Amino acid sequence: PPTLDSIITEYLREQHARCKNPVATCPPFSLFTPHQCPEPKQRR
């Protein structure tokens, strides 16, 4: 059987799969806000 540790982990990963240009060592997530990986906004 699964635990809520595994359920919330899979819930974030299915939201992490919407990231254009995803990362590997991600920051700690925030369940109260959406999760968007940092897209390239070219300043230089």
Q: Is 24 one of the binding residues for a copy of itself (CB under 8 A)?
A: no
Q: Is 6 one of the binding residues for a copy of itself (CB under 8 A)?
A: no
Q: Is 10 one of the binding residues for a copy of itself (CB under 8 A)?
A: yes
Backbone φ and ψ of 7, nearest 5°? -75, -45
Among 20, 21, 27, 31, binds a copy of itself (CB under 8 A): 31
Closest by CA position to 13, among listed 40, 26, 2, 39: 26
Residue closer to a copy of itself (CB basis): 24 or 31: 31
Residues 22, 23, 24, 28, CA torsion sign: negative
